[PDB]
Design a binder for this molecule. Structure first.
Ligand SMILES: [Cl-]
Ligand SMILES: [Cl-]
Ligand SMILES: [Cl-]
Ligand SMILES: [Cl-]
Lengths: 173, 173, 173, 173
């Protein structure tokens, strides 16, 4: 058992393990989104790249949480990882809307954990979220929102043209 | 006559010579496709470049087969090369559909030769196809499929615009 | 739907998706093993590093399979990922024994898929496993076996001493 | 008298001066621990180096607090520095246990000051501790805990052997 644990509640420990699950779930979702846009009958490489990069980012966030759990003397506990919500993700617009929904849910979990940390007077936890998660998440959601606006502007009456142009001229490929 | 030939059937030797003919035919087809897209009244440089590169690739595949024939102590035998199926190749979409048909026929010839090799217990032949042909062909067909999907998405109600944009923004020029 | 799929059975497609699940499960197991050896009350950094590296390797194997699924025109389908078999992994010896069991199960899945590929006359699948999976797996299992032998030799009557020395002098830290 | 002081309570000012004393006390303790492990009849250079480095770190923490006191317009007030708790520090294990006790006491003083800052609505103080003290302290305690676990594992029935090996193979020398 740990000889280091100090000021680290069971409630925070448990919430950290749940958050890890949420981040790995998100990572899995992005993995599926990336490979859907790699299909020969979808074939939007920039969209594929965007979501593959997010899968790695979410995995890295989970790993940081797990590292922190150990630093504080809590015990990492892994649960089953549920499969993503869809097998096929529709259009770029559909996908980007789904990603924003997912990110808003992750963001709310971060805010909830921050509030728990605050209530438990755990300033290290609060600091950790502030320093490595909250601003990263705000910046990502702004980026997604910007992308959504551009995708929406391009639907017009020529959806295929607009979806191609967005992938070619906004996304890195 | 050869002093080296070992485990190399007449059936495989003949099938290798036929495959050489198929690859040189494919090369000739791509040569014609490249020069059609170089016409002043077609003028799609990226499409021209794509098919010219494929002509060279197919020629190189034939040359590898011929080198292997000699390595095994078989005798290269050349036949007439039939001219390509069309004199004019239509749209980029028409052309890319024709290329996929051609590649699927080459792929099936590779698979047939692999099966013959397997039946004749000729592991060098089998290895050779696995190592230099089968994955190269799968990768090319995936690329073509991706291109076809993008071309199809761009037809919309503005075909000329879409054909220009594909050539400018997907193909190397 | 795909316009490229050729010689790719439904049976192989399904087996590839199952294998992806097995590799991601293995990755998750190694993630848990790595963080267990990072606990302050375990504190074997070289062991942690070893299993973290394996988590990444297994993830990369899954990604290669998914890329290949798309190259062939099959459809990636993701399933729930079961949590690892244990929450706490015992000694270095216990852990390395569990890893070998896991690797032997992955190896047998690769061999089974190879046999299916052979039966379905799918030489691209067979080649793919030969070229990127079978030898990598044999090499990993040999490494694990070597490690197990060294760990076993060091138990003696001074288990803690031996476990420290193995981590310091065999594993990269 | 200061012309700058704003939102800086007398309670925080006093608590900052007390914390400075605690950090300089800790520095003095580590100085004594370092020179004990430099004795010819102890002679554990890596252990000496470890504690000498900590003496400098604790001094640097005090200096940062003093700099911040002045930045806020408070007045540094120095008190007597009590000598360390022991003249001789026993084994490496004894020493590392004493260091963890000391660090836990410093950590609790940081948490107490953070709570006071929070209650006094002094976000600069809170930020300062979060940014330069809380995570540094968590990381140090994790390191010490890891070291303690390794030292404990090496006691076995051959304490001298284990103490030598830890110093040679874990600590920088
Ligand atoms: Cl379960
Ligand atoms: Cl003739
Ligand atoms: Cl389900
Ligand atoms: Cl005095």
């Amino acid at each position: 058992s740990s000889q280091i644990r100090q000021n680290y509640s069971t409630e925070v420990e448990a919430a950290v393990n749940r958050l890890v699950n949420l981040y790995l779930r998100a990572s899995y979702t992005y993995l599926s989104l990336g490979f859907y846009f790699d299909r020969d009958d979808v074939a939007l490489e920039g969209v594929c790249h965007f979501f593959r990069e997010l899968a790695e980012e979410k995995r890295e966030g989970a790993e940081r949480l797990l590292k922190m759990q150990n630093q504080r003397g809590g015990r990492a506990l892994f649960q089953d990882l549920q499969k993503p919500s869809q097998d096929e993700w529709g259009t770029t617009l559909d996908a980007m809307k789904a990603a924003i929904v997912l990110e808003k849910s992750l963001n709310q979990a971060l805010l909830d954990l921050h509030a728990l940390g605050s209530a438990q007077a755990d300033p290290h936890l609060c600091d950790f979220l502030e320093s490595h998660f909250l601003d990263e998440e705000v910046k990502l959601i702004k980026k997604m929102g910007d992308h959504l606006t551009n995708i929406q502007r391009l639907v017009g009456s020529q959806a295929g043209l607009g979806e191609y142009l967005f992938e070619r001229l906004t996304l890195k490929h």
